[PDB]
């Protein structure tokens, strides 16, 4: 909303840019003055023809020369205007991009914590591009339009005072978004369905969601047709006003001719310039809006470009002592996160360490261990306390020297999207390959330097070969090693590694730890096998120091706890709109009517100018009144037919949009969940696709047919009129015709690559700051943006050339055709009326690709029909579920990632009412077996059988019905509590009494009352943000309503607060009575009262048995009890 002054927008103006902008403005002024001057000479030639009707050759030669000079000057002025403004825009944008990225790099880390990486990325891309296009091209066109308006008004004042007063007195007559609301409700229910599609599919709720979307779509269709009728009525009234302006202006011209004060040329001139001024104002409004938006974005980016961090990374101050012993001391550190200063994490920390003194930090998770690591890197400046390096304050030390002095290994190793070469060279700007060999050997990655297929040029990153955790950690260690660090900062360096990876990584850490002080953080004894001093960072505080022996003598509780796209055809697109036969025909009829009427408007124009030469007052008065009435009548018929066309096409398009949206939603519900795994199938992307592509398809069919009919009618009618009016009219009209295509015609991947490099830098801002390699990324950004500047400059030059050629060809065709028709009349092929008619008529009268690709997307979306069918009704419906489950030899790979086989020969049995809990490792894919049970995916190997019946042969709806599911993240819909709870059963009507009786089993009966007296709270989740345990409880109640035979639990204990644990467990126990129940969880609480246990690893059942049984067998579960 805040916006910056227009003068400040160009504040990055050097001398060359100032000269360029001056030239652009002074050429736009010339163009704007030129066009009304063409109007003046139009009036003069009209007067000359009027005189000839009652000597023409010399006047015509002079007029043709005037027109040719006018074309030359408009060509030069337009080219220099557009090219110079675009070049100034390019220079300004290059400067803005460079300074913006430089300041972003210079910005503080806390500033990066407050803001978001995605917000900064969309800033750097969209705001910069908006500034570019807006400032350059739109201020150019704005200045030109303003100049045209000014010149028109000054000529109006010069020629006729009284006429200008007449226009001013008529101007009071000229003086005299809920579709977004409808589609907002529609998109609200669409997002509620798609985002929470797990629950919708889990309850066979596609039917009622289809019904609700249908109702919202009917409301949206009504609101859209109303808005279309309003907009097209407004446009028709506008055109009508122009036509009565024609009529009244010509009536007034007739009365002046009766008074013999203003000649016909003068009145035509003033009328034309007034109308062109009004048209230019209408055209300059949208670019004014665009400039306003551009200046808003300019303020939003200038808030950053005008800033300085409290800890300047490029500060020239601070000391640079060459001699560093390696002391690191913290005294009385009090600090809280600038992101959330309310919560204190560090209060009076005190810990010292000498040179070469290995020290480790041990404590609870998120107790502030990483805060000291960030602090010593100057990530934040503590409010109090002293943090000294060899009796030298870090504040009094240059930050570049400090960060180059310390080598930091991150908990998550990450590699920049480029080759291995500089990814390891980033230690120092200067390197010799021998140092690279030494570091590679030192990092234990030398085994892989040739095991990788290529040489030291392998493209490593997301786009390149996907590395492994061990390899990434090793290369990160090498990258740190290249700097020859003196103090190593290892924050949770042991993570996301296999056992052998852990051993080799720790060996590398012990090799590098020699002769180098280190403040190491880890949760495993591997780093404490040799740690000299241990620091108990507990409850956000230090407890004591000492070696492992002293800590053992003093309540070693920590160890005790850790002891162990086909483009469819146009006919195919129209086939979707076949049902609108009369609407299509009527729209085409009105389009043909407009195409008929426009040339007839031109013809009556020519006729009235022809009769204006008669030297008889009665005849001219009668003819002027008759033709003014004819002009009013044709304006009225245009209004009627255009409003009728607008209504017809709007309703046809809205019906097509409704049909397409409902078909897309039906396909969406019908298709399986696996398709949604692809990142291209995000909920927001699909919703915006629905909206934009439906609108584009309706526009495609309707507007395409309308404008094709209208344009073909215009061209045909003009060709026939020209042909009957004599030869040569078709000839020069076809010579003119090609300019219209160019007039209507009116590198970004390199910008995308630059934005990718950016997103890498900002997303890794802590890492790239830890290496003081911001200048290297700045240089890479410069090199990447080098080419886009050049392509933009060349494209701008081409744009200017083609624009000027369009204008120059318009003027040149005007003059040449007029002169050559003058030779025709001199010989006598046709009278002056014919050339006047052709000139006026033709030379002032007269998104689909995106829409087509939208139609192709929607068409392909309606024919996928995956292997797993959810809305399918074919199959079998067993009379009663027997409560038995069997998995035999099921092998599986995730459809979104077929490179990681999850399930390998899994086998399991489940009997009636048999409690079989499922436990195992985290993230191995235990939820995949539940998704298999719900038939969310197709098992390509093995079989899943229920009560002696396989999943393939039974109806999917029956399977989804007789089942239960409790998602780990409960979701509630935007409606009353009664509807949300009744969502459990849809195949039968729900009554309030049974709903209450069954919801009493969840023990939420009392809690529903603590809200508006209607216990079926309409808000649900509108303003009363209910607690997470309460949402979990109501989700369980929803999953319990149908008393399903077999129960599936998806991490009920996960993400559950301890307060609601007792009530949730009680409700689940009451639910798990007398019926088979399958639970996956990481908590032993439900496992205590469990008949059978199944323990999983990497996608196989490794052992089976009961709690006490498996404890007796001393199995893998026994080692996993911890």
- In angstroms, the CA 127 to CA 122 distance is 7
CATH topology (fold) of 974-1043: Rossmann fold (3.40.50)
Listed residue (1114, 1104, 1111, 1117) closest to 909, CA to CA: 1104
- Which residue's structure tokens are 């309409």? 1018
CA distances from 768 to 359, 765, 978 (A): 26, 5, 53
- Give the integer Cα–Cα distance in Å for 301 and 127: 7
For the chain, the farthest-separated pair of C-alpha atoms sits apart, in whole angstroms, at 126
3-state secondary structure of 341: coil
* Cβ(751)–Cβ(860) below 8 Å: no
Strands 943-946 and 885-894: what pairing? antiparallel
Burial of 612 (0-12, 13-18, 19+ CB in 10 A): buried
Helices then strands, each counted (H, E), the chain: 39, 21
Cα four-point dihedral sign 596, 602, 603, 608: positive
Query: What Å distances lie between residue 560 and 286, 564, 1071, 1122, CA to CA?
Result: 72, 9, 38, 11
Residues in CB range of 1066: below 8 A, 6 or more apart: 1003
Q: What is the resolution of this structure in A?
A: 4.0
Q: Look at phi and psi of residue 391 and say left if phi exceeds 0, alpha if psi is from -120 to 50, else beta.
A: left
Report residue 239 CA to chain centroid gap.
Answer: 38
Burial readout 803-831 (b: 16 or more C-beta within 10 A, e: otherwise): bbbbbbbbbbbbbbbbbebbebbeeeebb
Alpha-carbon gap, residue 666 to 872, rounded angstroms:
12
In the DSSP assignment, the letter for residue 321 is -
Q: Which two tokens stand for residue 441?
A: 């050997």
The encoded tokens of residue 617 equal 């007052």
Describe the chain by its helix, strand, coil percentages, rounded to 5. Answer: 60, 10, 30
Instruction: Characterize the bridge pairing of strands 533-538 and 359-362.
Output: parallel
d(CA 376, CA 388): 9
The dihedral region occupied by 948, where left means phi > 0, alpha psi between -120 and 50, and beta the remainder, is left
Which residue in the block uniquely carries the two structure tokens 């006490």? 1108
The encoded tokens of residue 1073 equal: 């009575």
Supply the DSSP symbol for 234: H
3-class DSSP assignment, residue 347: strand
SS3 call for 631: helix
Angle between helices 832-840 and 581-611 (to 10 degrees): 140
Determination approach? cryo-EM
The CATH class that applies to domain 177-261+566-719+849-871 reads mainly alpha
Per-residue three-class SS string for 38-99: HHHHHHHHHHHHHHHHCCHHHHHHHHHHHHHHHHHHHHHHHHHHHHHHHHHHHHHHHHHHHH
For residue 1022 the two structure tokens come to: 């509108």
Q: From residue 349, how far is each of 329, 332, 548, 596 by CA, in Å?
A: 10, 5, 21, 87
Q: How far apart are CA 548 and CA 978, in angstroms?
A: 60
CATH of domain 328-561: 3.40.50.300
Is the distance from CB of 956 to CB of 872 less than 8 angstroms?
yes
Name the residue with tokens 């047709």. Answer: 225
* Cα 222 from Cα 183, distance rounded (Å): 11
Residues whose CB is less than 8 angstroms from the CB of residue 734 and which lie 6 or more positions away in sequence, other chains included: none
Q: Are 1105 and 1093 in contact (CB under 8 A)?
A: yes
Distance CA 879, CA 552 (A): 66
d(CA 309, CA 315): 10
Gyration radius of the chain over CA positions: 39
Strand, helix or coil for residue 403: helix
CA 11 vs CA 83, 88, 132, 302, 534: distances in Å = 21, 12, 14, 11, 56
Residue 452: Cβ-neighbour burial (10 angstroms; 0-12, 13-18, 19+): middle
Strand order in the sheet with 533-538: 406-409, 487-491, 517-521, 359-362, 533-538, 541-542
Q: Where are the beta strands (DSSP E) in 522-591?
A: 533-538, 541-542
Identify the three-state secondary structure at position 1028. Answer: helix
Tokens of 950: 């396989």
Inter-axis angle of helices 617-670 and 848-861, nearest 10:
30
Could you tell me if 686 and 194 are in contact, meaning their C-beta atoms sit under 8 angstroms apart? yes
Locus of tokens 């890794």: 764
Give me the torsion for CA of 716, 717, 723, 725, rounded to 10°.
-170
Evaluate whether 520 touches 527 at the Cβ level (below 8 Å).
yes
In sequence order, what DSSP letters do the residues of 285-301 get, joined into one string?
A: HHHHHHHHHHHHHHHHH
CA distance 236 to 404: 70
Q: In what order do the strands lie in the sheet with 1077-1080?
A: 964-966, 1047-1050, 1077-1080, 916-920, 1092-1097, 1100-1105
User: If phi over 0 gives left and psi between -120 and 50 gives alpha, with beta otherwise, what is residue 1043?
Assistant: left
* φ/ψ (deg, to 5) at 775: -60, -35
Strand, helix or coil for residue 593: helix
Helix-helix angle 139-159:161-175, to 10 degrees: 130
Residue 84 to residues 80, 131, 138, 238, Cα–Cα distance (Å): 6, 16, 13, 36
- Other Cβ atoms less than 10 A from the Cβ of 864: the count is 12
Cite the DSSP H helix spans in 841-915: 848-861
Closest CA to 489 of 427, 412, 409, 404: 409
Q: What does DSSP say about strands 487-491 and 406-409: parallel, antiparallel, or unpaired?
A: parallel
CB 867 within 8 A of CB 935: no
Residue 459 DSSP one-character state: E
- Answer whether 328-561 and 974-1043 agree in fold: yes
Residue ranges per structural domain of the chain: 177-261+566-719+849-871, 328-561, 974-1043
Instruction: Report the C-alpha gap between 784 and 755 in whole angstroms.
Output: 10
């Amino acid at each position: 909303l805040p916006m910056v002054g227009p003068l400040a927008l160009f504040r990055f103006a050097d001398g060359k840019d100032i000269v360029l902008i001056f030239m652009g403005t002074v050429m736009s002024v010339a163009h704007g003055a030129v066009l009304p001057l063409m109007c003046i000479v139009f009036g003069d030639m009209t007067d000359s023809f009027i005189k000839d009707s009652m000597t023409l050759q010399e006047d015509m030669q002079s007029f043709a020369i005037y027109y040719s000079i006018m074309g030359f000057v408009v060509l030069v002025a337009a080219y220099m205007q557009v090219s110079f403004w675009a070049l100034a825009a390019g220079r300004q944008v290059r400067r803005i991009r460079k300074l913006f990225f430089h300041r972003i790099m210079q910005q503080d880390i806390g500033w990066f914590d407050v803001n978001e990486t995605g917000e900064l990325n969309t800033r750097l891309t969209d705001d910069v591009y908006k500034i570019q296009e807006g400032i350059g091209d739109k201020v150019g066109m704005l200045i030109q339009a303003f100049s045209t308006f000014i010149t028109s008004f000054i000529i109006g004042f010069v020629k006729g005072w009284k006429l200008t007063l007449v226009i001013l007195a008529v101007s009071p007559a000229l003086g005299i978004a809920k579709e977004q609301t409808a589609y907002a409700k529609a998109g609200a229910v669409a997002e509620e369905v798609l985002s929470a599609i797990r629950t919708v599919f889990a309850f066979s709720g596609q039917d009622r969601e289809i019904k609700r979307y249908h109702k919202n779509l009917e409301d949206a269709k009504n609101m859209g047709i109303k808005k279309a009728i309003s907009a097209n009525i407004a446009m028709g009234f506008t055109f009508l006003m122009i036509y009565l302006s024609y009529a009244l202006a010509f009536w007034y011209g007739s009365i002046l001719i009766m008074s013999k004060e203003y000649t016909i040329g003068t009145v035509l001139t003033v009328f034309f310039v007034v109308l062109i001024g009004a048209f230019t104002m209408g055209q300059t409004s949208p670019n004014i809006q665009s400039f306003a938006s551009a200046r808003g974005a300019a303020h939003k980016v200038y808030s950053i470009i005008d800033n300085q961090p409290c800890i300047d990374s490029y500060s020239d101050a601070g000391f640079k002592p060459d001699s560093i012993k390696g002391n690191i001391e913290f005294r009385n550190i009090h600090f809280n996160y600038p992101s959330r200063p309310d919560v204190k994490i560090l209060n009076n920390m005190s810990l010292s360490v000498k040179s070469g003194q290995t020290i480790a930090l041990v404590g609870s998770s998120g107790c502030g261990k990483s805060t000291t690591i960030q602090l010593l890197q100057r990530f934040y400046d503590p409010q109090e306390g002293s943090v000294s390096i060899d009796t030298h304050d870090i504040r009094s030390l240059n930050v570049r020297y400090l960060r180059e002095m310390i080598g930091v290994v991150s908990q998550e190793p990450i590699l920049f999207a480029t080759t291995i070469a500089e990814n390891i060279k980033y230690g120092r700007p200067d390197v010799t390959q021998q140092e690279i060999e030494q570091a590679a050997k030192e990092a234990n990655a030398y085994d892989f330097i040739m095991n990788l297929p290529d040489k030291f040029e392998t493209l490593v990153g997301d786009r390149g070969t996907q590395m492994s955790g061990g390899q990434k950690q090793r290369i990160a260690i090498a990258r740190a090693l290249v700097r020859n660090p003196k103090i190593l900062l290892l924050d949770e360096a042991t993570s996301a590694l296999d056992a052998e990876s852990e051993t080799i990584v720790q060996a590398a850490l012990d090799k590098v730890r020699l002769g180098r002080t280190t403040i190491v953080v880890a949760h495993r004894l591997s780093t404490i096998r040799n740690a000299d001093v241990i620091a108990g960072f507990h409850k956000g505080d230090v407890i004591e120091l000492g070696t492992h022996s002293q800590l053992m003598e003093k309540q070693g509780v920590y160890y005790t706890l850790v002891t162990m796209v086909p483009p469819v055809s146009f006919l195919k697109v129209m086939r979707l709109n076949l049902s609108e036969w009369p609407y299509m025909a009527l729209g085409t009829f009105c389009a043909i009517i407009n195409g008929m009427m426009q040339p007839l408007f031109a013809v009556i124009f020519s006729k009235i100018i022809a009769v204006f030469a008669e030297p008889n007052q009665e005849i001219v008065r009668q003819k002027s009144e008759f033709f003014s009435l004819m002009f009013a009548a044709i304006g009225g018929v245009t209004f009627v037919t255009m409003f009728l066309q607008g209504f017809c096409f709007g309703k046809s398009g809205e019906l097509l949009t409704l049909k397409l949206r409902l078909g897309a939603f039906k396909s969406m519900m019908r298709q399986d969940l696996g398709w949604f795994d692809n990142p291209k199938n995000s909920v927001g992307a699909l919703t915006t696709r629905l909206a934009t592509d439906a609108a584009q398809v309706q526009g495609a069919t309707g507007v395409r047919m309308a404008t094709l009919a209208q344009n073909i009618a215009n061209l045909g009618t003009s060709i026939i009129i020209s042909f009957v009016y004599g030869w040569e009219l078709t000839l020069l009209i076809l010579s003119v015709v090609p300019i219209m295509a160019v007039a209507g015609s009116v590198d970004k991947k390199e910008l995308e690559k630059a934005g990718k490099i950016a997103t890498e830098a900002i997303e890794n801002i802590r890492t790239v700051a830890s290496l003081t390699r911001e200048p290297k990324f700045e240089s890479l950004y410069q090199e990447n943006l080098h080419v886009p500047y050049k392509n933009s400059q060349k494209k701008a030059h081409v744009y200017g050339f083609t624009f000027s050629f369009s204008q120059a060809m318009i003027y040149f065709a005007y003059a040449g055709c007029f002169r050559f028709g003058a030779w025709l009349i001199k010989e006598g092929r046709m009278d002056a009326e014919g050339v006047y008619l052709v000139i006026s008529a033709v030379l002032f009268g007269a998104n689909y690709a995106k829409a087509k690709m939208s139609a192709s997307h929607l068409m392909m979306l309606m024919n996928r029909e995956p292997a797993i069918d959810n809305l399918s009704e074919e199959g079998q419906s067993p009379d009663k579920f027997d409560g038995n489950v069997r998995f035999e030899g099921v092998k599986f790979n995730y459809p979104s990632r077929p490179e990681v086989p999850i399930l390998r020969g899994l086998n399991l049995k489940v009997s009636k009412g048999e409690t079989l809990a499922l436990v195992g490792s985290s993230g191995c894919g235990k939820s995949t077996t539940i998704q298999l049970l719900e038939r969310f995916y197709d098992p390509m190997h093995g079989k899943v059988e229920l009560d002696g019946i396989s999943a393939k042969q039974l109806n999917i709806h029956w399977l989804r019905s007789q089942i239960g599911i409790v998602s780990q993240e409960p979701v509630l819909f935007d409606c009353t509590l009664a509807e949300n709870i009744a969502y459990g059963d849809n195949s039968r009507t729900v009554t309030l009494e049974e709903i209450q009786a069954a919801a009493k089993a969840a023990n939420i009966h009392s809690f529903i009352e603590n809200l508006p007296q209607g216990y079926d709270t309409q808000a649900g989740d509108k303003g009363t943000q209910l607690s997470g345990g309460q949402k979990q409880r109501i989700a369980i109640a929803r999953a319990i309503l149908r008393n399903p035979k077999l129960l599936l639990l998806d991490e009920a204990t996960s993400a559950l607060d301890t307060e609601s644990e007792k009530v949730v467990q009680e409700a689940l126990d009451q639910a798990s009575r007398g019926r088979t129940c399958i639970v996956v969880a990481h908590r032993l609480s439900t496992i205590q009262n469990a008949d059978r246990i199944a323990v999983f690893q990497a996608g196989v059942v490794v052992e089976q048995g009961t709690h006490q049984q498996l404890l007796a067998k001393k199995g893998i579960y026994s080692m996993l009890v911890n």
